[PDB]
C-alpha cells in the first residue's frame, strides 16, 4: 500500500478549482479554475509562481505541451487558448465551438490540440496556426474528455451520451465505439501509458479499465462516490501501479490496478475532489476541490 501524506496546501483561486496537471518535465503544477484563471505552482514545494489570465469565463481544463513550454485551456467562453508559460502570454485563441469547451489535450508531437465541447463535437486544431483542422460529430451530448494515445494516431473521446469512441487522428473517422451492457454517462476517459488500455469513469460510482484491441472490460474499480461531476482519474506509475481518483465524498481514492482493492483514501479536502494528477517521476499526487474548499493539496508517498 502507498502511504501518501499531505505536504502542502495551495491557496489562491477564488472559486472552485477545475483541474490540476503536472508539467512533463515535472517542475510545475498548473491549475485551472472557474475563476477564469490559470495558476502555476512549484511541483515539489507548492511555491506560487504566476497567474495566467485572459479567458472571459470559467475554465474546465488545462493541459501541457510535451516540452513543458505551452499550455492549452478550455473555457466556458467557447474558446481554447494556447499559452506560453514563461511569458504568460496568450499565443492563440481557438474559436469554432458553439458552446462551452470542456476538455483539451496536446498530441505527443504537440503540433495538434484536440478539444471536446458541450456542443457535442470534438475538434482538432493546428497549434502553429491556431486554426481548426477538423470538426468531428463525435457524440450526441456534451463531450467529457479527449485524449491522444502514445504515438498520436488515435484519439479517445467520452460523452454524457454514454459512449466512448476511438478516432483515427489523420482522417477523423471513427475506428471503434465501446458500449457496456448499459450506457450511464461517461464522465472521463484516457488511454493508459502504453496506449493499449482505456480508463473510463461513468456516473454510477464506477471506473473501468478496457482493453482497446479487444473492446472488453478488464478491471472494475468501485467504492468512491461519483454520480454528479466529471472527475478525472489517473494511472500512477512512479511506484506501485495504482489507479487514482477524486470523489464526491471529499476523498482521494487509490486502488491497486491489478487487484482492484482500495489501498488508500486521502482525507483533507472539504469539498468534492474534482481533479487529481500524478507526478511524472516522483510519488506525488496533486488534488483539487470545489467551492467550499478551492485549494490544491500535494501529497507524497514513500512508495
Amino acid at each position: 500500500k502507498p502511504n501518501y501524506a499531505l505536504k502542502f496546501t495551495l491557496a489562491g483561486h477564488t472559486k472552485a478549482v477545475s483541474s490540476v496537471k503536472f508539467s512533463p518535465n515535472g517542475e510545475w503544477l498548473a491549475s485551472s479554475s472557474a475563476d477564469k484563471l490559470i495558476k502555476i505552482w512549484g511541483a515539489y514545494d507548492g511555491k506560487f509562481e504566476k497567474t495566467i489570465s485572459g479567458h472571459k469565463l470559467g475554465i474546465s481544463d488545462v493541459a501541457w505541451s510535451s516540452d513543458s513550454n505551452l499550455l492549452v485551456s478550455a473555457s466556458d467562453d467557447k474558446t481554447l487558448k494556447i499559452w506560453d508559460v514563461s511569458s504568460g502570454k496568450c499565443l492563440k485563441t481557438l474559436k469554432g465551438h458553439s458552446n462551452y469547451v470542456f476538455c483539451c489535450n496536446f498530441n505527443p508531437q504537440s503540433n495538434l490540440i484536440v478539444s471536446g465541447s458541450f456542443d457535442e463535437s470534438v475538434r482538432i486544431w493546428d497549434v502553429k496556426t491556431g486554426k481548426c483542422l477538423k470538426t468531428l460529430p463525435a457524440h450526441s451530448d456534451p463531450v467529457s474528455a479527449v485524449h491522444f494515445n502514445r504515438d498520436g494516431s488515435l484519439i479517445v473521446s467520452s460523452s454524457y451520451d454514454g459512449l466512448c469512441r476511438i478516432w483515427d487522428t489523420a482522417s477523423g473517422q471513427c475506428l471503434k465505439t465501446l458500449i457496456d451492457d448499459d450506457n450511464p454517462p461517461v464522465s472521463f476517459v484516457k488511454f493508459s501509458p502504453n496506449g493499449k488500455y482505456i480508463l473510463a469513469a461513468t456516473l454510477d460510482n464506477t471506473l473501468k479499465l478496457w482493453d482497446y484491441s479487444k473492446g472488453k472490460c478488464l478491471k472494475t474499480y468501485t467504492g468512491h462516490k461519483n454520480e454528479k461531476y466529471c472527475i478525472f482519474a489517473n494511472f500512477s506509475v512512479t511506484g506501485g501501479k495504482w489507479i487514482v481518483s477524486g470523489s464526491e465524498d471529499n476523498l482521494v481514492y487509490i486502488w491497486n490496478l491489478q487487484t482492484k482493492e482500495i489501498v488508500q483514501k486521502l482525507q483533507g479536502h472539504t469539498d468534492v475532489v474534482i481533479s487529481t494528477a500524478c507526478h511524472p517521476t516522483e510519488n506525488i499526487i496533486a488534488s483539487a476541490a470545489l467551492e467550499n474548499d478551492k485549494t490544491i493539496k500535494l501529497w507524497k508517498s514513500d512508495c
Binding site: K15, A16, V17, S18, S19, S33, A34, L57, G58, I59, S60, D61, S75, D76, Y100, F102, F118, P142, Y160, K228, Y229, C230, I274, L290, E291
Partner: peptide, 6 residues
C-alpha cells in the same frame, strides 16, 4: 464549467 453539475 466542470465545477458545476450538468
Amino acid at each position: 464549467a466542470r465545477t458545476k453539475q450538468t
